[PDB]
Amino acid sequence: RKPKTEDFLTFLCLR
Amino acid sequence: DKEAAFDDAVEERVINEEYKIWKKNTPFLYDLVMTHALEWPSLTAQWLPDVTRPEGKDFSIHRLVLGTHTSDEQNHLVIASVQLPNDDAQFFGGFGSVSGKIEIEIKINHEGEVNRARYMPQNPCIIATKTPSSDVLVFDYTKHPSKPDPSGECNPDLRLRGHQKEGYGLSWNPNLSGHLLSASDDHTICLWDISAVPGKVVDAKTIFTGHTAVVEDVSWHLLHESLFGSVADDQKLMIWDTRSNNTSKPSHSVDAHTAEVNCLSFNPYSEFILATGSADKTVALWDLRNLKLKLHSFESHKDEIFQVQWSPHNETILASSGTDRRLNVWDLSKIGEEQSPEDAEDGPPELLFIHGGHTAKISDFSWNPNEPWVICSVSEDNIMQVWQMAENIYNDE
Amino acid sequence: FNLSAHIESLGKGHSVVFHSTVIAKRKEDSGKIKLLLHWMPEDILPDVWVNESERHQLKTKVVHLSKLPKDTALLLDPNIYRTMPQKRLKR
Amino acid sequence: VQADHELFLQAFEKPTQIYRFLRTRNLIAPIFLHRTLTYMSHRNSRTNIKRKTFKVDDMLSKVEKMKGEQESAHLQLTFTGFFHKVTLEVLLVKVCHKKRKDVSCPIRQVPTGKQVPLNPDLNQTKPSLAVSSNEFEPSNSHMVKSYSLLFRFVAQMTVFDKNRRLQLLDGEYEVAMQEMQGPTLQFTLRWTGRQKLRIFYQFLYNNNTRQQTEARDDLHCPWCTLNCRKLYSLLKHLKLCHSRFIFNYVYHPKGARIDVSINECYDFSRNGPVKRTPITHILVCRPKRTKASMSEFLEW
Ligand SMILES: [Zn+2]
């Protein structure tokens, strides 16, 4: 299974 | 201080981001969006009652009463013409950058900014204006040239005295020809009977001194010739009767809002209903049979409301505008309607539509009397918009 | 408290999660005990009087952003709503 | 390498931040109602039926009846003791409604005034009286937002809320105090009168896939959590509300593959009036189904 789109995008903010 | 200047720069960016998002969604929110950049902003907007249809043509000519708000330049009273399509209409942007669709027909020299311009319903050639000075000016546009004299000389047909300050409130009696009311920052309401009174100066027939703060708006009752309402920074709504001999006390006085009341509008379909707009961010609903009850309070605007107008075509439809850069269309028939969680998330059931096409305070707006659901709205960034929300919002099947 | 981080963890991407604290208690003339709950984040939600039994299942309160009191919801960030310009020459 | 991957991350981070921020802002302060978008019709439960029969006049009767089925006295407070391990002044805090001029809600403070025992021993008790006059009114409701009691270590407690309801009932109270377990004030108060789709978002940079993902909540916008309910609605939402990206949809019976890429074509003074060059634009113009035009008053 692939990482979830919402988690990818959350990662992107919190950086 | 310095922190606020930073947050304002951020906001300017955010406002433009949201503006781009609105532009892309317009074909999915509206049946019509015309956007015009006026040379100078207009503090006033009002559709004239007339519509012309050229015989061998698929459009009709509509007209507006606008004005100018300059920065060290000549001000004019403006009559603009707008071409809307017929029923056999035209096929982000669709026809961006168009020509000959919104034009200035008449421009007449005016002493300072037009705070408000309104046409006399009995003869729509006569326009009354609110100046940044004490006088209220009356113009019969037919009695003036379209092309203004570059000298700038303002020659109004009548000069109405007297207030001691400028104002915004202005209202012609739709049942007594030439009976005009005006509100001022001098706490008073003046009344003139221009219908017969002859130099080219006219003094007030009656001055009503009930308010104790800046009077913001004044409006005649649309069905009963001896009634009018006024709103002031008093936090009060006052109902007046011309027949009364006491001009210091109204027929009714209401503690209408929790801050300055800026506008009022009488329903054309009902002899009892009216609505008020306030700095308290709400639109209040009133029934003249019992002013000791606020029928409803419409809450959605994030800031002051400066205009409130009923739809000329629908008794349950009211629109409000302000400094939050939005124009909200309300439906009283939807008050109290049960909602799905998704529906309830967008706002109360009475809120029919939010128009977020403006990126600055909305100075005024006007419902087109010949074309249902067509509104013209003007902002302080020089942008005028002629728009109509998508039919499926108000119609079914 | 970072609004972005909070909404993304506790809030499931759309809500604010409040925590209560007992700041007062009262014993009525009738045999009943009520508690005054104070919400955290502070100054957004009002203090609520609650039954002594009702303390639990009220230790936290998850409010959807569109359900926050709109007057006070702006305290959450300087750029949710702003008056542009703040300083006005004309009405 | 890691330098190229960080540029990829950086490209997607800037718009994601904007969209996630607007998710918060627009949920409180919208640009437009999503229920009013044509590709979002499902969002609104309701219809326009009532309107044709709705009579604005009949609202008074209905409102007057609701009011008919809805809900004076001095307030006395007797202090028993301050607990810790003192001079106690009580004030009536009047938080007033904000007027246009005011920066914030003006606070009006009315002093009420006494000496209360420190850690009083019960079974050794031998009093402090501070009463409040009817300063509250349903008359000054247009001026005063809410009324509150200030105890001063300090503590505050509202007597009447915004919707003006008495929440400080008669009884035996204990309030927690604060600097500038826990200091307390003890008093007696009396009023003395359905099928999961597989939606993959592939993030492309240099027009080749650098991050493969799968939406957890299939028909919810990953940027702003909007529950579009149909794939049709989700694709319009994405393409129009998130135009900083180019979305390339690829159909599958089991879901969809949406390819996300960076749109490389994304793009007054506020002090006094400003001259401009008149320009007109027609963003939308569509023929209406039902002809509404007031043709009777039309000139030739
Ligand atoms: Zn989205």
Any A CB within 8 A of C14 CB: no
Distance between CA atoms of residues B184 and B169, nearest Å: 7
| D16 closest CB neighbour out of A3, A4, A13 | A13
Give the distance from residue B197's alpha carbon to the nearest chain D alpha carbon, in angstroms.
32
Helix ranges, chain D (H)? 2-28, 59-68, 231-241
Taking an 8 Å cut-off on Cβ atoms, the answer to whether D271 and C85 are in contact is: yes
Q: Nearest Cα to B209, choosing from B230, B235, B178? A: B230
* Chain D CA closest to residue A6: D222
Taking an 8 Å cut-off on Cβ atoms, the answer to whether A4 and D201 are in contact is: no
| D33 closest CB neighbour out of B27, B338, B346 | B346
Technique used: X-ray
In order, the DSSP letters of D64-99 are HHHHHT----EEEEEEEEEE---B--EEEEEEEPPP
Residues B157, B162, B168, B173, CA torsion sign = negative
Burial-class residue B145 by CB neighbours within 10 Å (0-12, 13-18, 19+): exposed
Distance between CA atoms of residues B191 and B173, nearest Å: 10
Q: For residue D140, how far is its CA from the centre of ligand 1 (angstroms)?
A: 45
* Contact residues on chain C for A6, CB-CB shorter than 8 A: 13
Any D CB within 8 A of C55 CB: no
Domain residue ranges of chain B, discontinuous segments joined by +? 1-397
Report the first-to-last Cα separation within chain A, whole angstroms: 24
**Residues with CB in 5 Å of ion ligand 1:** D 221, 223-224, 226
Question: Which chains does chain C touch, 3 or more C-beta pairs < 8 A?
Answer: A, B, D
Paired with D199 in beta bridges are D256
Taking an 8 Å cut-off on Cβ atoms, the answer to whether C85 and B8 are in contact is: yes
Cis status, amide bond into B357, omega within 30 of 0: no
Question: Three-state SS for B344?
Answer: helix
Return the exposure string of B148-160: e unless at least 16 CB atoms fall within 10 Å of the residue's CB, then b: beeeeebebbbbb
Taking an 8 Å cut-off on Cβ atoms, the answer to whether A2 and D200 are in contact is: yes
Distance between CA atoms of residues C17 and B134, nearest Å: 55
Six token digits for residue B231: 């709103």
Look at the block and give the residue holding tokens 């001194």: B209
Look at the block and give the residue holding tokens 């050639």: B125
Any D CB within 8 A of A14 CB: no
Distance between CA atoms of residues B382 and B71, nearest Å: 13
DSSP state for residue D154 in the 8-state scheme: B
> Å resolution of this model?
2.9
Residues D208, D211, D217, D220, CA torsion sign = negative
Q: Are B282 and B267 in contact (CB under 8 A)?
A: no
Six token digits for residue B291: 């002013």
Could you give the C-alpha distances from D286 to A7, B28, B397, D182, D272, in angstroms and in order?
A: 41, 11, 17, 68, 36
Question: Three-state SS for B392?
Answer: helix
Return the exposure string of C26-65: e unless at least 16 CB atoms fall within 10 Å of the residue's CB, then b: beeeeeeebbbbbbeeeebbbbbeeeeeeeeeeeebebeb
DSSP state for residue D108 in the 8-state scheme: E
* Contact residues on chain D for A8, CB-CB shorter than 8 A: 201, 203, 211, 213, 222
Composition of chain B by helix, strand, coil, percent to 5? 10, 45, 45
Look at the block and give the residue holding tokens 């049946």: B31
Where chain D is discontinuous (C–N > 2.5 Å), the residues before each break are 71, 85, 113, 126, 152, 180, 193, 267
Could you tell me which CATH number the domain at B1-397 has?
2.130.10.10
Which residues 126-185 on chain B approach chain C with CB closer than 8 angstroms?
A: 168
Give the distance from residue D151's alpha carbon to the nearest chain B alpha carbon, in angstroms.
28
* Contact residues on chain A for C5, CB-CB shorter than 8 A: 14
* Chain C CA closest to residue D184: C24
Integer-rounded Cα Rg, in Å, for chain B is: 21
Composition of chain C by helix, strand, coil, percent to 5? 20, 35, 45
| B28 closest CB neighbour out of D37, D54, D98 | D37
Between helices B2-25 and D2-28, what is the axis angle to 10°? 90
Look at the block and give the residue holding tokens 């128009």: B355
Paired with B241 in beta bridges are B227
